[PDB]
């Protein structure tokens, strides 16, 4: 099934094709693959447009290939496409944030390009589909409709003009790649990614090598538009999704568990045969006076090592995308650099962190299961270490990062009111890897008013670095389920 086919056999029943060739609405806007998907879903859902599985995938794909955005146009907003759990979303100003990012992310707006006329239709679509919109908080406090027409629509048209769709990705991405990345809660990894063209798609196998073992997933993937890589891979009963950006033969992005997007990893991948290039080094810090193993992931790094003053050590192995080093710094705490295969590698020497911060420091978890069709939504935390940097500091935009440190995790009531309710007792528990698992959904007759197993919690992490006074907290809202969700929140 082709896009042209669905466009003529399904879309044309309501959408007019002008003598100009352009389609009504269809050609007045550009958005991401996820964006076009949500639009097609609404056509099927709201306007009874019958679409077979292949037709649906076909037009969605066709729209992403012809009317998508450039990778540069998604900059700053990829967090919403990747389901990145540690994110911050807002509009360009208070007005826009309040009127457009109060239901869904403002990122859903910023990832679209339209003509002034179409932005008008879109705002008319909102008040027409959700008429109570103008009665809700942040809307009933003002002349919503009046301001939508005078200020909001002209802002959208002015700020996100149609422009022109980029050229589709034309090239063969098949081949072996070397990768490196991290999975919060588990750690760093290296690995391989191989693609085998199959029609317009690619067969894909991604192998992840953690210090405690490796695992491979296999499935299908494809490139949409200028460079949006999307793939679904499996291994046993586990399924993951890749949401990458492909540019200059290099993949960059996030993959996640298909049954829980909060769980996943970030990575970068380049052709296995590429010229000398460093992808990452793990760990990226050195505990002064102590010899440590370091894994420098990349291509053609070989074993030519030129170490700086304060660090001594050697190369233990090389090849297959990773060069293992064995160093030891003896200088003073601070940023250190070396060369390998002529490529720069940055590290940080230290003896003890000046402080640790919890990432995310503000987040949510959602109750689930308990016989219901909606599974729990966990929250992954990690304790990051730091150095006050050059300014004295204790916490300003200056600082030097040390990376994630192993820690002891605990939850507690956020405040007095929460204690009275015994939130920490019912909201769930956090394990030693900093993974918070929420409680069962549904009313709990054991709590007052038989309320849900929700709670206003505090997450405290304590890393055992000597020197010793080290701890940090995070704010966790163990809240209720969401019955509406979408590719782009």
């Amino acid at each position: 099934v082709t896009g042209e086919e669905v466009l003529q056999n399904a879309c044309a029943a309501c959408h007019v094709q002008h003598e100009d060739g352009r389609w009504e609405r269809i050609d007045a806007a550009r958005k991401t693959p996820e964006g076009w998907d949500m639009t097609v879903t609404r056509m099927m859902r709201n306007h009874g447009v019958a679409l077979e599985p292949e037709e649906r995938a076909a037009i969605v794909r066709h729209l992403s290939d012809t009317r998508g955005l450039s990778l540069a146009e998604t900059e700053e907003r990829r967090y919403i496409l990747e389901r990145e759990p540690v994110a911050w979303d807002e509009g360009p100003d208070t007005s826009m944030t309040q009127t457009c990012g109060r239901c869904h992310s403002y990122a859903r707006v910023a990832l679209q390009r339209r003509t002034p006329e179409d932005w008008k239709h879109l705002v008319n679509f909102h008040l027409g589909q959700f008429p109570t919109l103008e009665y809700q908080a942040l809307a009933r406090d003002r002349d919503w409709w009046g301001i939508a027409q005078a200020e909001i629509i002209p802002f959208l048209a002015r700020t996100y003009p149609l422009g022109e769709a980029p050229d589709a990705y034309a090239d063969d991405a098949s081949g072996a790649y070397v990768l490196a990345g991290r999975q919060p809660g588990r750690g760093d990894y290296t690995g391989r990614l191989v693609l085998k063209k199959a029609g317009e798609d690619y067969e894909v196998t991604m192998t992840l090598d953690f210090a405690d073992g490796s695992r491979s997933f296999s499935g299908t993937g494809r490139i949409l538009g200028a460079g949006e890589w999307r793939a679904t891979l499996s291994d046993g009963t586990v399924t993951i999704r890749q949401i990458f950006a492909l540019q200059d033969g290099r993949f960059s992005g996030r993959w996640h568990d298909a049954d829980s997007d909060v769980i996943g990893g970030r990575l970068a991948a380049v052709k296995a045969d590429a010229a000398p290039q460093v992808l990452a080094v793990a760990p990226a810090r050195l505990k002064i006076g102590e010899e440590t193993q370091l894994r420098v992931a990349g291509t053609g790094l070989g074993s030519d090592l030129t170490l700086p003053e304060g660090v001594a050590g050697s190369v233990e192995s090389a090849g297959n995308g990773v060069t293992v080093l064995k160093l030891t710094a003896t200088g003073t705490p601070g940023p250190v650099s070396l060369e390998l295969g002529g490529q720069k590698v940055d590290l940080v020497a230290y003896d003890r962190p000046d402080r640790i911060s919890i990432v995310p420091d503000l987040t949510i978890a959602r109750i689930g299961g308990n016989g219901g069709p909606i599974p729990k939504v966990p929250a992954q935390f990690e304790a990051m270490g730091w150095l006050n940097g050059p300014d004295g500091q204790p916490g300003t935009g200056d600082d030097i990062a040390l990376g994630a440190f192993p820690a002891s995790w605990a939850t507690d009531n956020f405040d007095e009111e929460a204690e009275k309710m015994q939130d920490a007792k019912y909201a769930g528990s956090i394990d030693d890897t900093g993974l918070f698992t929420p409680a069962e959904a549904g009313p709990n007759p054991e709590r007052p008013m038989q309320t849900n197993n929700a709670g206003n919690l505090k997450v405290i992490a304590t890393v055992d670095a000597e020197g010793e006074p080290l701890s940090a907290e995070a704010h966790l809202y163990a809240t209720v389920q969401r019955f509406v969700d979408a590719p782009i929140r």
Binding site: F125, L127, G128, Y135, R142, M449
Partner: protein
């Protein structure tokens, strides 16, 4: 003799005999899902009207017989119309005032239309007039003398149903602006029948007090007397909790607010009288004809009775199958012995 008309999803209207604390009759309506919204009882307690079908329709029904005597479909092929929370029967039971938030449905786009108030002749259910009304109006309520139609929007809108115009705007949005922050009003519950007073709590803050200081936030009471045509806005307590709706007693000496707690207010002192907790969240509040019983509803499927004086729970009437009342309006009506 007091009775309660409570909607129950997806297509019911349950009449409760408050005296025997039991269900009196269950009226089932066709094409009514997902739930009826705004029910109205005609003088005499025999005939009722209810907005149904996603607020796009309204049916006339015989409370005793249980049959549907007629229906009004506000939507047409090219125009979807929502009544939302605005629907009111005139005191003389002759004309229905229906708010209309419409959207024109074109082949591949929507065109938001100006909001309207449509008047229907009750006996025949025929559309007799339609005029443009301000937007963002939740409830419509008739003056007791049937001369004016009030609409609760960003301001209390006074409309002349005869001329079909907006004659006066009673300030809300800018109430005591030199002293308080813009009033926040979330009112969707029609429950002024017993007192003839449409009331809703509103939230604001003292402008001359640090916004970080919790004592800056105040809870106010908005009362629109449908008999005298006077609206009053005054602070009643430092805001520590939130109430979804409020009902004034027939004597107009007290107002009761509810959500997760039930609290009574002395309207003569404009101060709190007493507060008690609740077993679960409630939305609606109504007061018996004798002013002795306060009724809480909405959210779930049980009507709870409370003594107006001690706020002690007197009893509870479960709707059939515990069918939820959601945010639909709960009304109290009478029938001569």
């Amino acid at each position: 003799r007091d009775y309660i008309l409570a909607p129950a999803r997806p297509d019911k209207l349950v009449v409760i005999d408050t005296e025997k604390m039991a269900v009196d009759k269950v009226i089932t309506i066709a094409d009514a899902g997902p739930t009826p919204m705004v029910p109205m009882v005609a003088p005499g307690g025999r005939i009722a009207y209810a907005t149904v079908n996603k607020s796009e329709s309204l049916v006339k029904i015989d409370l005793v017989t249980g049959e549907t005597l007629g229906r009004i479909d506000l939507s047409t092929p090219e125009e979807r119309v929502k009544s939302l929370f605005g629907a009111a029967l005139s005191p003389d039971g002759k004309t229905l005032a229906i708010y209309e938030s419409p959207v024109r449905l074109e082949l591949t786009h929507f065109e938001v239309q100006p909001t309207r108030v449509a008047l229907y002749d009750a006996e025949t259910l025929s559309r007799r007039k339609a005029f443009e009304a301000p937007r963002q109006i939740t409830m419509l309520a008739w003056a007791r003398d049937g001369s004016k139609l009030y609409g609760l929007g960003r301001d209390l809108h006074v409309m002349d149903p005869e001329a079909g115009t907006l004659v006066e705007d009673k300030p809300i949005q800018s109430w005591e602006a030199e002293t308080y922050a813009q009033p926040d009003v979330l009112a969707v519950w029609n429950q002024h029948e017993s007192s003839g007073v449409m009331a809703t709590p509103f939230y604001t803050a003292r402008k001359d007090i640090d916004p970080a200081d919790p004592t800056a936030y105040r809870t106010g009471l908005l009362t629109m007397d449908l008999e005298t045509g006077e609206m009053a806005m005054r602070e009643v307590r430092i805001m520590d909790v939130f109430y979804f709706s409020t009902a004034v007693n027939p004597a107009k000496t007290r107002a009761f607010g509810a959500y997760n707690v039930l609290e009574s207010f002395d309207l003569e002192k404009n101060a709190s009288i007493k507060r008690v907790p609740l077993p679960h969240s409630y939305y609606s509040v109504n007061v018996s004809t004798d002013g002795s019983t306060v009724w809480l509803g909405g959210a779930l499927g049980d009507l709870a009775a409370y003594d107006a004086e001690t706020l002690e729970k007197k009893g509870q009437v479960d709707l059939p199958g515990n069918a939820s009342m959601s945010l639909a309006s709960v009304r109290l009506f009478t029938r001569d012995e």
